[PDB]
Amino acid sequence: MALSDTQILAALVVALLPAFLAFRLSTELYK
Amino acid sequence: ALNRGDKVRIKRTESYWYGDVGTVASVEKSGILYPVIVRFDRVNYNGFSGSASGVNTNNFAENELELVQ
Amino acid sequence: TELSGQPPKFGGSTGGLLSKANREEKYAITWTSASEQVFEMPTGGAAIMNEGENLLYLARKEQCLALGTQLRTKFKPKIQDYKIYRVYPSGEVQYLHPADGVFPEKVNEGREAQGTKTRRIGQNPEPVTIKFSGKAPYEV
Amino acid sequence: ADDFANLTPCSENPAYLAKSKNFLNTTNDPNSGKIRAERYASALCGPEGYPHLIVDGRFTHAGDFLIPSILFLYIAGWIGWVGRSYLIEIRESKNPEMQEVVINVPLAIKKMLGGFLWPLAAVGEYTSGKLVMKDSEIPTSPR
Amino acid sequence: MDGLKSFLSTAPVMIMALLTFTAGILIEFNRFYPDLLFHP
Amino acid sequence: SHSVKIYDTCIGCTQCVRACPLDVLEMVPWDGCKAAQIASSPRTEDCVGCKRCETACPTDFLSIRVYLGAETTRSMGLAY
Amino acid sequence: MATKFPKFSQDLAQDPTTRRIWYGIATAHDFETHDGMTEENLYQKIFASHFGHIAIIFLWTSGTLFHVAWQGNFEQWIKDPLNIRPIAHAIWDPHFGEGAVNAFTQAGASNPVNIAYSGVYHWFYTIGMTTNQELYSGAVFLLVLASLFLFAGWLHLQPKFRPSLAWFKNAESRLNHHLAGLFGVSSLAWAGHLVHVAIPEARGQHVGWDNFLSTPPHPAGLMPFFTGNWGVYAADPDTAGHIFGTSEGAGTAILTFLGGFHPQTESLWLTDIAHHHLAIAVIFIIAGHMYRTNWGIGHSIKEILNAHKGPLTGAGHTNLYDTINNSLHFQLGLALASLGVITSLVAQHMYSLPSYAFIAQDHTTQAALYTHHQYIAGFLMVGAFAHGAIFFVRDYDPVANKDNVLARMLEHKEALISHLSWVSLFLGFHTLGLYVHNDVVVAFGTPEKQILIEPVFAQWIQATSGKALYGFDVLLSNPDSIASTTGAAWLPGWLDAINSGTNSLFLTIGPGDFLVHHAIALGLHTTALILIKGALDARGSKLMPDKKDFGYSFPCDGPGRGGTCDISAWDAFYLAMFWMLNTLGWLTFYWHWKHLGVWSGNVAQFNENSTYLMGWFRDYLWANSAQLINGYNPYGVNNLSVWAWMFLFGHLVWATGFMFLISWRGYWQELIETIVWAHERTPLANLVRWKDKPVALSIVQARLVGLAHFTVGYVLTYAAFLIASTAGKFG
Amino acid sequence: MDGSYAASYLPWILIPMVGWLFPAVTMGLLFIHIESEG
Ligand code: CLA
Ligand code: CLA
Ligand code: CLA
Ligand SMILES: CCCCCCCCCCCCCCCC(=O)OC[C@H](COP(=O)(O)OC[C@@H](O)CO)OC(=O)CCCCCCCCCCCCCCC
Ligand SMILES: CCCCCCCCCCCCCCCC(=O)OC[C@H](COP(=O)(O)OC[C@@H](O)CO)OC(=O)CCCCCCCCCCCCCCC
Ligand SMILES: CC1=C(/C=C/C(C)=C\C=C\C(C)=C\C=C\C=C(C)\C=C\C=C(C)\C=C\C2=C(C)C(=O)CCC2(C)C)C(C)(C)CCC1
Ligand SMILES: CC1=C(/C=C/C(C)=C\C=C/C(C)=C\C=C\C=C(C)\C=C\C=C(C)\C=C\C2=C(C)CCCC2(C)C)C(C)(C)CCC1
Ligand SMILES: CC1=C(/C=C/C(C)=C\C=C\C(C)=C\C=C\C=C(C)\C=C/C=C(C)/C=C/C2=C(C)CCCC2(C)C)C(C)(C)CCC1
Ligand code: SF4
Ligand code: SF4
Ligand SMILES: [Ca+2]
Ligand SMILES: [Cl-]
């Protein structure tokens, strides 16, 4: 098929999680 | 104990003539840490870039010399 | 105290002091001259030193020392009484050269020995033996 | 029997024959192309028509590499040995350096002429001479 | 004089002389016996 | 700033002090060589790192060594 | 006073110039030199950095999968893989004009798009993925995987979960878990995936998360694996007429070993791949039981290394456990050398024995893969030798390693360096002489006097693997040989694939291959000579007998003692980079010209013209460029516009690197001083003043920047040429 | 510029954001951090 319109803008919310965790890891490694 | 004319090998590791052979020119009196004057045939590296030769004399100690003849 | 001497006769140049002299630091060279002479400016071009006392402000210490070497190596009556100071924006003056009134080329009593290692060059400690410290072979 | 099945002798290769019919004259000899076409028909050729050389080591192709190798080894040993013995004899002339810049012509020629026996003098110096030097008597750098 | 011979015996003169002599040797060898790719 | 160290292989020929363009080095009394003197580096904060003192040194490998460290206005040789 | 950044270096934070900025970026990862670094904190920070890096790899892979699913034609590509070109992702660039839009609406796309060139389509297809939703769920799951590793890296920096130094220095247990668990169990799981999904999907049997528990991959269950009759699993392998994705020619086998190539896809059989993975899994699990941990039984690396004494060597390998286990540069250099070797190995084995369906036909993707992985391998090798030199500078202990192998390697370093010099001079002298002879011979209208020497040894090696073209009849090329009459199920397919001149397996070589392999030998010898001379003199030489006191990277030691430019081991790395790039250039030139000849069937051009260098100059470089340099011209734009523009971009970057490489600092510092004067004296601009004093780039920084531009340009321009030529010719 | 793929409005605003807003913000933050304290 073709990827759903609602499907493309659903992976971005899931990507918000590794974004938060990479932010946390960066800030912790800066210490 | 070394005298003038003593062919000797340098043991200073960092020396340019470490393993090379040099002839003793004079030994300064006691007190000095490196009195044994050794002249060499192969000039070292001293001199500004592009210069001709180098220095062919240096002062060592008795402990830094191995005696030949 | 207060540095004295007439400024050398100079028409000006673009190589002199910049904002550093007033924001950060500056340097001064004083010297007495047996006659009105022409010398070379470390910042480019020729200048005329007055007979008597001369005070000149320069941006860097190496410039004053270059002027001193020129005074002591390029003139018939060698100028060697020159003094080099460091001036701060608060007007403070720190005497610099020659440190103890005697040139550092020749030995003089009263001087301590700093940076002197009792060992040989090739007797420095191996770096692995001092690793994870804030020191280098030439510091311990 | 069927070794080197990818190659065929230049005489049996048609491309080589066609090209050798029009080989170019090298020197003033108008038969230089003809004699080259006759000399290269001996070796093995490829599909294009140019000869391939075989350094496999077999003595059927001993001229492809073995004989030039032997010749160059002899001549280069000659050069190296005469130069080395010239430098060593120079070593004992009080001023060796300016004789290394300004070439002592008679000594150099005497060393050069007596170079046809380099492969024997080499083992002569190796057996109990000065060819190889002890490591501890050679200047080195810090480790 | 002696200095003329010493000049004729310098490093560049001797090296160019030997190079020219060897050049002549090889050029004549390939002139009379050319296209010697391999030994029969 | 840069570090300028002096070692016991010093012969006291005063050449490195004469070669210094920023008055970093001094000749202090010593008792380890004939000249009865040794080199010192009191004014290291004015060292730029031009290695001239090493260039003018005669000992087999230098007795005076310059190690380039934290750069500043004085070490970078800035007139601005 | 302090300028805060960088927090890990007050010597930099108190720099009042722009250097403070640059060096702050250049020394951030060098944790060993951070102010007050301890070994334990070093290891823990490295652990968290590893976690972050694994998350980054997972995120990049998820990006590949997601963009292929979203903006690709994977499902359309499966319908006709040999004609439909795979697309990486769509373009969205406001700079584009109508010509560019029309040129990049390609491969049956309704919008501008770039066509994929990494062979990831063939990968995903041979793996068993057949829809877009599978790629999508994979991308999302990999997002979650990156999240897991990011949280793990965050957790391992907390005082409640910080691994201690002794835990990091447990070599035995780590080797056990990596050999048995990381390597073996993973190849086991990949074999299980190939058996359950890849092979059934190759035969038209859909296996997803909705049915994999119900349908067994073999008509027999696990009892033939349980009992011992494993030949049940060989059953009826896929016939030589199996069409991929369908049931025609399909069988029930899950573990075979017929060797050769799938007749349609022209790749290795999936059953043989899964069988290979199973065998390697067993081997690795066996390996992962060698070193003791907490049950007394097992080996200790230190005792094994200590036991290997000897007469002529001396101390042998004594104390090498502590030598390698306490130096991270040693471990990193070992890892980098091994990984570069095996990356070059992957490159050599993927073009010759491909493993993804229909990727042998996609010539551009294969060229790009070979070039990419050979470049990665070159970088890894240079880095390995750099870290060896760094170990010598920072971590080498002469008393704990006295008279051992390391100390002896250092003790005769002059012999090693001088003999590398001899072999390099030898190779270069003679290879360049032969090339120039061939050039001068072809030039004068007498191409018959070229020195063509047959690569006899390598042709003989090919024959030992069953190659009968050269008529060697040796070992597996001889049917009467013992090695050829053993009854091995892999002999027929192997001989059929190696004796059919239709693929890329053991390509026929002429004298040109001989010449270029000697060029490759020169390149390797010279690059390794640079690197080894740098590592062995890193601790010192006769110019700097105390070079270890100054560190791995320093500008120089001044003009004194004759001049000391490029003295440090870092300068040896920077020198060796040029020769490594040149070696990879020779590699890729040879590979690409020979493969273009092979793909066009006109191998005569390469076999007849690769002997003289003008052949390479006009028949390879000049010729295959004709398409590229017309991606845009006074007449319009085709699909090679980006590649031509990037070709010229790489040229520009390369020359800009030349700029930093030839001209050295002081000139620029004086120029910058005049510009500073200008700014301080120009009105209105005097309202503004710099926070950091402008200064010229440092010497080492200038080498690094010139080399960075050189390498960027090298890679980009050669990639543009490779892609554009192979894609406009279609092989 | 267009796109038959779903959510083709996303690159419309996402390309300027990755190319203008994100770089300006990151460069401004890093510039303030470089020149902090004094
Ligand atoms: C079985 C238990 C186990 C397992 C699963 C792991 C797993 C891992 N450890 Mg760990 N560890 C363990 C126990 C274990 N550890 C123990 C007991 C100790 C000692 C007490 C350690 C201490 C330790 C340290 C200190 C570190 C690790 C690190 C790592 C990671 C290695 C780097 C990496 O991710 O690349 C993955 C590598 C592979 C998958 C192997 C690939 C095989 C090679 C490369 C060839 C490739 C084959 C194939 C063709 C490739 C596929 C290509 C594809 C595109 C088609 C890895 C995921 C490192 C890390 O990253 O920290 C998180 C690290 O620093 N471990
Ligand atoms: C085409 C460019 C080029 C050439 C010819 C060379 C040449 C050489 N490099 Mg080099 N290199 C290059 C590029 C080049 N480099 C670049 C861009 C870099 C980065 C800066 C380096 C950095 C580098 C390093 C770090 C090292 C070398 C080394 C070497 C030498 C190794 C010996 C060899 O390879 O075989 C043999 C030699 C050749 C093929 C070239 C000479 C052949 C000539 C044509 C012979 C004829 C001489 C001629 C007749 C003399 C008379 C001339 C007269 C008319 C005036 C060699 C002489 C290594 C070395 O020194 O090995 C010991 C070494 O360590 N190179
Ligand atoms: C490293 C992986 C990666 C890469 C290289 C790309 C590449 C690209 N993407 Mg994509 N994207 C990715 C992952 C990736 N994507 C993932 C996982 C998703 C689903 C969440 C998306 C969803 C997405 C959308 C909706 C769009 C793009 C678009 C684009 C293009 C412009 C960038 C942009 O505007 O969007 C920015 C990207 C995001 C907002 C998603 C975040 C990317 C991942 C989750 C994080 C990557 C972090 C990684 C470590 C890189 C850090 C930098 C590095 C130096 C450490 C570009 C070619 C645009 C396009 O279609 O071009 C025409 C666009 O419309 N991407
Ligand atoms: C297409 C033509 C190519 C044009 C390129 C021009 C290059 C210009 C380079 C600038 C420097 C030139 C000035 C050199 C003068 C100069 O000072 O150069 C710079 C360099 C100086 O080095 P130093 O600073 O260390 O020298 C100081 C010493 O005097 C110490 O006392 O000298 C050398 O290069 C030595 C190499 C000589 C090479 C000897 C070979 C002799 C060749 C014989 C044949 C001559 C040709 C005949 C005519 C056909
Ligand atoms: C094929 C590569 C093309 C040329 C590359 C250069 C080759 C180097 C050969 C030069 C002569 C070496 C001088 C040895 C100097 C020497 O004899 O040392 C003395 C040493 C005596 O060792 P021990 O009896 O003490 O052995 C006990 C050990 O446990 C401790 O080292 O001899 C040997 O180790 C055995 C033969 C030397 C093996 C040298 C390895 C050289 C590598 C050759 C290729 C390795 C391939 C490995 C594949 C698994
Ligand atoms: C109860 C239990 C058992 C039953 C287990 C059952 C019932 C199922 C086992 C399932 C397993 C063990 C699944 C393993 C799955 C791993 C998967 C699915 C994927 C890993 C993928 C990675 C890491 C990255 C993949 C990538 C992505 C995502 C792509 O899309 C492209 C390729 C690549 C880039 C590689 C048995 C009786 C057996 C033993 C006794 C215990
Ligand atoms: C034949 C053959 C071949 C080859 C083989 C081989 C591999 C060989 C080798 C060899 C070797 C492995 C060697 C080594 C060695 C060592 C040494 C050590 C030597 C040298 C020495 C010396 C001591 C010298 C001296 C001299 C002289 C005598 C003369 C000149 C001068 C000089 C001084 C140089 C080929 C395949 C190609 C082809 C076929 C067969
Ligand atoms: C500097 C240094 C370092 C580094 C080093 C390096 C970098 C090295 C290298 C290198 C390399 C990278 C090497 C490799 C090699 C090789 C080998 C090891 C071989 C193998 C072999 C064999 C034995 C094979 C066999 C076979 C064949 C022939 C075919 C068929 C199959 C078989 C298997 C049978 C370190 C850190 C460590 C330490 C410190 C110092
Ligand atoms: S130049 Fe060297 S030996 Fe002479 S005084 Fe200075 S440090 Fe001592
Ligand atoms: S590096 Fe320059 S300024 Fe510093 S002590 Fe040596 S000569 Fe003087
Ligand atoms: Ca499926
Ligand atoms: Cl154009």
Curated annotation (Swiss-Prot), chain A:
Taxonomic superkingdom: Bacteria
Location of this chain's protein in the cell: Cellular thylakoid membrane
Disulfide bonds, paired cysteine numbers: none
One family name in Pfam for this protein: PsaM
InterPro entries per UniProt: PSI_PsaM (IPR010010), PSI_PsaM_sf (IPR037279)
Key words, A-Z: Membrane, Photosynthesis, Photosystem I, Thylakoid, Transmembrane, Transmembrane helix
GO BP of this protein: photosynthesis
Main subcellular location: membrane
Bilayer topology: Single-pass membrane protein
GO cellular component, one term: plasma membrane-derived thylakoid membrane
TM segment ranges: 6-25
Family: Belongs to the PsaM family.
Protein name per its UniProtKB record: Photosystem I reaction center subunit XII
Organism this protein belongs to: Synechocystis sp. (strain ATCC 27184 / PCC 6803 / Kazusa)
Curated annotation (Swiss-Prot), chain B:
Keyword Electron transport: no
Main localization (coarse): membrane
Underlying gene: psaE
Function: Stabilizes the interaction between PsaC and the PSI core, assists the docking of the ferredoxin to PSI and interacts with ferredoxin-NADP oxidoreductase.
GO CC terms of this entry: photosystem I reaction center; plasma membrane-derived thylakoid membrane
Recorded family membership: Belongs to the PsaE family.
Keyword Signal found: no
This protein's name: Photosystem I reaction center subunit IV
One GO BP annotation of this record: photosynthesis
Membrane topology: Peripheral membrane protein
Places the protein is found: Cellular thylakoid membrane
Keyword set, alphabetical order: Membrane, Photosynthesis, Photosystem I, Thylakoid
InterPro entries: Elect_transpt_acc-like_dom_sf, PSI_PsaE
Swiss-Prot record, chain D:
GO cellular component: photosystem I; photosystem I reaction center; plasma membrane
PANTHER family documented for this protein: PHOTOSYSTEM I REACTION CENTER SUBUNIT III, CHLOROPLASTIC
InterPro entries referenced in this protein's UniProt entry, alphabetically: PSI_PsaF, PSI_PsaF_sf
Keyword Signal in record: yes
Protein name in UniProt: Photosystem I reaction center subunit III
Keyword list, A-Z: Photosynthesis, Photosystem I, Signal
GO process terms (BP): photosynthesis
Homology family: Belongs to the PsaF family.
The encoding gene: psaF
Biological role stated in the UniProt entry: Probably participates in efficiency of electron transfer from plastocyanin to P700 (or cytochrome c553 in algae and cyanobacteria). This plastocyanin-docking protein contributes to the specific association of plastocyanin to PSI.
Keyword Signal: yes
Gene3D superfamilies from the UniProt entry: Photosystem I PsaF, reaction centre subunit III
Curated annotation (Swiss-Prot), chain H:
Tagged with keyword Transmembrane: yes
Signal peptide: none
Regions that span the bilayer: 12-32
InterPro entries: PSI_PsaI, PSI_PsaI_sf
GO biological process, one term: photosynthesis
Gene Ontology CC: photosystem I; plasma membrane-derived thylakoid membrane
The keyword Transmembrane is assigned to this record: yes
Keywords: Membrane, Photosynthesis, Photosystem I, Thylakoid, Transmembrane, Transmembrane helix
Compartment list: Cellular thylakoid membrane
NCBIfam families, A to Z: PRK11877.1, PS_I_psaI
Protein name per UniProt: Photosystem I reaction center subunit VIII
Gene transcribed to yield this protein: psaI
